[PDB]
Design a binder for this molecule. Sequence first.
Ligand code: MYR
Ligand code: CL
Lengths: 378, 8
Amino acid sequence: RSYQFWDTQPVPKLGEVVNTHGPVEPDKDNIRQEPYTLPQGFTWDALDLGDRGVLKELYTLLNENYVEDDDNMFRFDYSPEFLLWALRPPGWLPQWHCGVRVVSSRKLVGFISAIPANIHIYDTEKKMVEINFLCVHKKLRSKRVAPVLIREITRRVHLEGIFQAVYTAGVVLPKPVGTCRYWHRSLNPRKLIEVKFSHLSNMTMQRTMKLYRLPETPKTAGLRPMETKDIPVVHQLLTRYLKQFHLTPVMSQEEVEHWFYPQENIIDTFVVENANGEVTDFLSFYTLPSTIMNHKSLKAAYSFYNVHTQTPLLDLMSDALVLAKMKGFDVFNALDLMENKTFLEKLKFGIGDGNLQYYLYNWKCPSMGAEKVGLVLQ
Amino acid sequence: GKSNSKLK
Ligand SMILES: *C(=O)CCCCCCCCCCCCC
Ligand SMILES: [Cl-]
């Protein structure tokens, strides 16, 4: 490949091997004030998701034009309540919900977002932003709109004093700090084969169903949904557990509440409260269904953060599978980052299509194995 | 952006 756009950006190129730790370019003393030029007929807009109609426009745009699998069958079916959870964490800005509209139609045909986050990369803690939901209407993809969306959100982030960012992609760009791989655990194998999420391996439908059968209830003592009183100890257990990885978020107790307090059809968090009344472990997974292109929806649970101090991680993730099975999910998704490679194969996960490349904008540092990534984005 | 993976 040739990277016309990323060669102009403060990122190292692919062939480069990094042995340093630091920014590529300095913090900017003066930042460009006017927005970048969009092609004629389109204008910028900051999306106030507090408007149910504006939020309605966004998920309609995403669920019709956002990322699909390699085979054109499944499109992420984002919920209005889900997007509020992902795009309104502590410190969010409406200007960082960067939208593009047709000038005459006022139709939403492009979007990119940024949320603030404290990132711990190796031995440095930096105030960065998390970029997500870069989406261009398929009719518009011919006018080079994506590079403009990146430069505009970069400008709007610079105006607030932030000069680093973390983001993911399924494509290889300059230059991945870490490469993870998706794994899938079938919870409802009948339907996954129906809609061709998976294929019958020679095994009958009866043999496949028996292999993926799960107990009706979890096995761990003191397992219960997280509630308000668990917020500090969940925050405490998460900060200590993340210190072993090299790329992690540094959450405040306010951010821990946002990302982990249970919300129906959005985020689920179960804590382990032992016989002495102490919370010693917790599991979490968020909800993200996919639109089935032909003959209607695929309920998928995505592993989030799973912290263990007294329960084995294998036992904890078995309960996550049981819980997700109970709640009606059809598949339990999890990356191979953090300690996930210790249970993926044992708990009958299957390796998936393609990777999730992790990237740092304006930060030069060595790469790390997937086992060292402690960051999960929405 | 997140990628949509499927069992290979
Ligand atoms: C998935 O949607 C990731 C989108 C990839 C675009 C890269 C964004 C680069 C950083 C933009 C703002 C950074 C400003 C510090
Ligand atoms: Cl490197």
